Structures are given as structure tokens and as C-alpha cells.
Motif scaffolding. Structure first.
Motif, PDB file in Angstrom:
ATOM      1  N   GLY A   1       0.790  -1.216   0.000  1.00  0.00           N
ATOM      2  CA  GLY A   1       0.000   0.000   0.000  1.00  0.00           C
ATOM      3  C   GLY A   1       0.828   1.274   0.000  1.00  0.00           C
ATOM      4  O   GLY A   1       0.414   2.293  -0.541  1.00  0.00           O
ATOM      5  N   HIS A   2       1.999   1.215   0.608  1.00  0.00           N
ATOM      6  CA  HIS A   2       2.812   2.401   0.809  1.00  0.00           C
ATOM      7  C   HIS A   2       3.916   2.556  -0.201  1.00  0.00           C
ATOM      8  O   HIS A   2       4.515   3.630  -0.288  1.00  0.00           O
ATOM      9  N   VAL A   3       4.248   1.474  -0.905  1.00  0.00           N
ATOM     10  CA  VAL A   3       5.500   1.415  -1.637  1.00  0.00           C
ATOM     11  C   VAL A   3       5.266   1.278  -3.135  1.00  0.00           C
ATOM     12  O   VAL A   3       4.638   0.328  -3.623  1.00  0.00           O
ATOM     13  N   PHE A   4       5.778   2.259  -3.860  1.00  0.00           N
ATOM     14  CA  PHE A   4       5.637   2.293  -5.297  1.00  0.00           C
ATOM     15  C   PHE A   4       7.009   2.393  -5.934  1.00  0.00           C
ATOM     16  O   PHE A   4       7.771   3.300  -5.607  1.00  0.00           O
ATOM     17  N   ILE A   5       7.300   1.472  -6.845  1.00  0.00           N
ATOM     18  CA  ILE A   5       8.590   1.392  -7.478  1.00  0.00           C
ATOM     19  C   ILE A   5       8.465   1.557  -8.971  1.00  0.00           C
ATOM     20  O   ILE A   5       7.442   1.221  -9.572  1.00  0.00           O
ATOM     21  N   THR A   6       9.516   2.075  -9.578  1.00  0.00           N
ATOM     22  CA  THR A   6       9.465   2.444 -10.981  1.00  0.00           C
ATOM     23  C   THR A   6      10.893   2.606 -11.513  1.00  0.00           C
ATOM     24  O   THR A   6      11.829   2.389 -10.765  1.00  0.00           O
ATOM     25  N   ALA A   7      11.071   2.973 -12.780  1.00  0.00           N
ATOM     26  CA  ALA A   7      12.410   3.180 -13.331  1.00  0.00           C
ATOM     27  C   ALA A   7      12.750   4.630 -13.254  1.00  0.00           C
ATOM     28  O   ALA A   7      11.986   5.455 -13.691  1.00  0.00           O
ATOM     29  N   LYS A   8      13.899   4.973 -12.727  1.00  0.00           N
ATOM     30  CA  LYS A   8      14.119   6.357 -12.400  1.00  0.00           C
ATOM     31  C   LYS A   8      14.061   7.277 -13.598  1.00  0.00           C
ATOM     32  O   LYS A   8      13.739   8.454 -13.455  1.00  0.00           O
ATOM     33  N   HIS A   9      14.348   6.772 -14.784  1.00  0.00           N
ATOM     34  CA  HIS A   9      14.375   7.661 -15.940  1.00  0.00           C
ATOM     35  C   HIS A   9      12.979   7.992 -16.473  1.00  0.00           C
ATOM     36  O   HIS A   9      12.839   8.938 -17.234  1.00  0.00           O
ATOM     37  N   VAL A  10      11.952   7.248 -16.085  1.00  0.00           N
ATOM     38  CA  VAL A  10      10.610   7.595 -16.538  1.00  0.00           C
ATOM     39  C   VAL A  10       9.933   8.496 -15.559  1.00  0.00           C
ATOM     40  O   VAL A  10       8.925   9.122 -15.872  1.00  0.00           O
ATOM     41  N   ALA A  11      10.467   8.533 -14.350  1.00  0.00           N
ATOM     42  CA  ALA A  11       9.773   9.194 -13.266  1.00  0.00           C
ATOM     43  C   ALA A  11       9.652  10.688 -13.523  1.00  0.00           C
ATOM     44  O   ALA A  11      10.531  11.258 -14.169  1.00  0.00           O
ATOM     45  N   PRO A  12       8.573  11.331 -13.017  1.00  0.00           N
ATOM     46  CA  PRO A  12       8.507  12.780 -13.131  1.00  0.00           C
ATOM     47  C   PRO A  12       9.497  13.399 -12.172  1.00  0.00           C
ATOM     48  O   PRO A  12       9.815  12.788 -11.133  1.00  0.00           O
ATOM     49  N   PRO A  13       9.981  14.599 -12.507  1.00  0.00           N
ATOM     50  CA  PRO A  13      11.059  15.196 -11.745  1.00  0.00           C
ATOM     51  C   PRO A  13      10.796  15.130 -10.252  1.00  0.00           C
ATOM     52  O   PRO A  13       9.651  15.214  -9.795  1.00  0.00           O
ATOM     53  N   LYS A  14      11.878  14.982  -9.506  1.00  0.00           N
ATOM     54  CA  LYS A  14      11.801  14.761  -8.078  1.00  0.00           C
ATOM     55  C   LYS A  14      11.178  16.017  -7.433  1.00  0.00           C
ATOM     56  O   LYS A  14      11.489  17.159  -7.810  1.00  0.00           O
ATOM     57  N   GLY A  15      10.253  15.790  -6.509  1.00  0.00           N
ATOM     58  CA  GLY A  15       9.451  16.868  -5.933  1.00  0.00           C
ATOM     59  C   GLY A  15       8.242  17.299  -6.764  1.00  0.00           C
ATOM     60  O   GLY A  15       7.765  18.425  -6.627  1.00  0.00           O
ATOM     61  N   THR A  16       7.731  16.405  -7.605  1.00  0.00           N
ATOM     62  CA  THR A  16       6.499  16.663  -8.350  1.00  0.00           C
ATOM     63  C   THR A  16       5.335  16.118  -7.536  1.00  0.00           C
ATOM     64  O   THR A  16       5.495  15.120  -6.856  1.00  0.00           O
ATOM     65  N   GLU A  17       4.177  16.774  -7.589  1.00  0.00           N
ATOM     66  CA  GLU A  17       2.965  16.253  -6.927  1.00  0.00           C
ATOM     67  C   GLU A  17       2.497  14.995  -7.635  1.00  0.00           C
ATOM     68  O   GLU A  17       2.249  15.039  -8.836  1.00  0.00           O
ATOM     69  N   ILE A  18       2.367  13.880  -6.914  1.00  0.00           N
ATOM     70  CA  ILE A  18       2.021  12.594  -7.548  1.00  0.00           C
ATOM     71  C   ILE A  18       0.937  11.827  -6.797  1.00  0.00           C
ATOM     72  O   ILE A  18       0.939  11.771  -5.579  1.00  0.00           O
ATOM     73  N   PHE A  19       0.013  11.238  -7.552  1.00  0.00           N
ATOM     74  CA  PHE A  19      -1.171  10.568  -7.011  1.00  0.00           C
ATOM     75  C   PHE A  19      -1.962  11.418  -6.037  1.00  0.00           C
ATOM     76  O   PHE A  19      -2.590  10.890  -5.117  1.00  0.00           O
ATOM     77  N   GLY A  20      -1.930  12.735  -6.251  1.00  0.00           N
ATOM     78  CA  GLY A  20      -2.559  13.704  -5.343  1.00  0.00           C
ATOM     79  C   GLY A  20      -1.875  13.923  -3.996  1.00  0.00           C
ATOM     80  O   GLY A  20      -2.495  14.438  -3.071  1.00  0.00           O
ATOM     81  N   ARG A  21      -0.611  13.518  -3.882  1.00  0.00           N
ATOM     82  CA  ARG A  21       0.185  13.742  -2.684  1.00  0.00           C
ATOM     83  C   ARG A  21       1.239  14.750  -3.077  1.00  0.00           C
ATOM     84  O   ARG A  21       1.724  14.728  -4.202  1.00  0.00           O
ATOM     85  N   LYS A  22       1.587  15.641  -2.161  1.00  0.00           N
ATOM     86  CA  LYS A  22       2.691  16.560  -2.385  1.00  0.00           C
ATOM     87  C   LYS A  22       3.965  15.984  -1.777  1.00  0.00           C
ATOM     88  O   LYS A  22       3.916  15.012  -1.020  1.00  0.00           O
ATOM     89  N   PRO A  23       5.119  16.569  -2.125  1.00  0.00           N
ATOM     90  CA  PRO A  23       6.348  16.135  -1.470  1.00  0.00           C
ATOM     91  C   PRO A  23       6.232  16.312   0.038  1.00  0.00           C
ATOM     92  O   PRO A  23       5.768  17.361   0.507  1.00  0.00           O
ATOM     93  N   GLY A  24       6.645  15.291   0.783  1.00  0.00           N
ATOM     94  CA  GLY A  24       6.491  15.296   2.237  1.00  0.00           C
ATOM     95  C   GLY A  24       5.448  14.296   2.678  1.00  0.00           C
ATOM     96  O   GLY A  24       5.428  13.893   3.838  1.00  0.00           O
ATOM     97  N   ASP A  25       4.578  13.894   1.757  1.00  0.00           N
ATOM     98  CA  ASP A  25       3.692  12.779   2.010  1.00  0.00           C
ATOM     99  C   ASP A  25       4.426  11.505   1.734  1.00  0.00           C
ATOM    100  O   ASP A  25       3.977  10.431   2.127  1.00  0.00           O
ATOM    101  N   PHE A  26       5.568  11.643   1.073  1.00  0.00           N
ATOM    102  CA  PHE A  26       6.359  10.507   0.704  1.00  0.00           C
ATOM    103  C   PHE A  26       7.832  10.815   0.704  1.00  0.00           C
ATOM    104  O   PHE A  26       8.260  11.973   0.647  1.00  0.00           O
TER     105      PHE A  26
END
Length: 173
Positions: free
Chosen positions: A20-45
Motif C-alpha cells: 500500500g505504501h510502496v511504489f517502485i518504478t524506473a528512475k528515468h521515466v519518473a517525473p522530476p523529483k518533488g512533483t505532486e504525484i497521485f494527489g500527494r505533495k512532497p512530504g507525504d512521501f
């Protein structure tokens, strides 16, 4: 399996809910670090990277419905795993791959470690833009995930998986 539902589009690629808490992916596809994702802002994760492996930990479960799986650091050579490729069309290809030996790579400007595998068997196989899709296998009587897809060799059947391994030492302060 029901599991296919864990695989989801992410950035310019794909990713996987290990828990439930852990989402993994390939770093080169990921949106830039500190982007709002799944409706969470940085600091929720909290994001830990490891080569082109990228792990998000969410303090609050984002997929509450879903069990945890074991996340191994790659696996043994000769183990037959399976990649869970979803395509933008929604088509789901379970590709069998015999896992191989480790191997470095460059993603542009950065050398990164991975475990290679040799697709077992025309149209078939992977494409760029499958990056992120997971590699999983049945260890005895149950299923673990061992890494994410990063890329495939121009020549034929070889593919690379990014792996995540837990730290083993610590620096102080």
C-alpha cells in the motif's frame, strides 16, 4: 492473477505497488523529483533511488486495498522470471525471461547496474516505454518482485532489469 492491477502508468513509463505504501518504478521515466504525484505533495512521501531503480514510500497507504509482496534484490542466474508488460492499449503480456548475470549500463550521463535476462522465446518482446514494468517470480509456493524493466538490447532477446538492495552500512552524522 489479480496482481496485474498493481501495474500502472507513471510519468513516461510504468510502475508497481509492492505494498500500500510502496511504489517502485524506473528512475528515468519518473517525473522530476518533488512533483505532486497521485494527489500527494512532497512530504507525504520519501523517495529512495538505487541506480535506475526508484522507490517511493508513502507515510499513508495510497493503495490501501493491496497486500505487501517481498521485494528481493534481483535473483539467481537461471531463475525463470516473468515481466509484466502493460501497453498503453491496456494489453497485458506476461513475457517469460531467464535471468542472467549482473551488468552495468549507461542511462544518459550515468552508469547504472542491472541484472540481465534473456527473453525465452516476431512481434514480441519489449519496447522502450515498457520501462518500469516489474519482474516477478514464483519462489517455491508464492510470488516476489525482483526488479523493474529499464531496457532491452537492440540485438534480440536480452533485457535489463534495475534492482534494489537494502543498504548494508551507515555513515554517522
Amino acid at each position: 492473477v489479480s496482481i496485474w492491477s498493481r501495474v500502472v502508468q507513471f510519468g513516461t513509463g510504468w510502475g508497481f505497488w509492492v505494498s500500500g505504501h510502496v511504489f517502485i518504478t524506473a528512475k528515468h521515466v519518473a517525473p522530476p523529483k518533488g512533483t505532486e504525484i497521485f494527489g500527494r505533495k512532497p512530504g507525504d512521501f520519501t523517495v529512495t533511488s538505487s541506480g535506475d531503480f526508484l522507490k517511493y514510500y508513502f507515510t499513508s497507504a495510497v493503495r490501501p486495498d493491496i497486500p505487501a509482496m517481498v521485494l528481493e534484490n534481483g535473483c539467481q542466474e537461471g531463475v525463470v522470471a516473468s515481466v509484466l508488460v502493460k501497453r498503453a492499449s491496456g494489453e497485458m503480456l506476461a513475457l517469460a525471461v531467464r535471468m542472467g548475470s549482473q551488468a552495468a549500463i549507461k542511462i544518459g550521463s550515468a552508469v547504472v547496474h542491472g541484472q540481465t535476462g534473456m527473453l525465452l522465446t516476431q512481434d514480441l518482446g519489449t519496447i522502450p516505454g515498457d520501462a518500469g514494468c516489474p519482474y516477478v517470480y514464483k519462489k517455491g509456493n508464492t510470488w516476489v518482485v525482483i526488479g523493474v524493466h529499464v531496457a532491452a538490447t537492440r540485438s534480440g532477446n536480452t533485457v535489463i532489469a534495475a534492482t534494489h538492495g537494502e543498504p548494508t552500512l551507515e555513515a554517522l552524522e
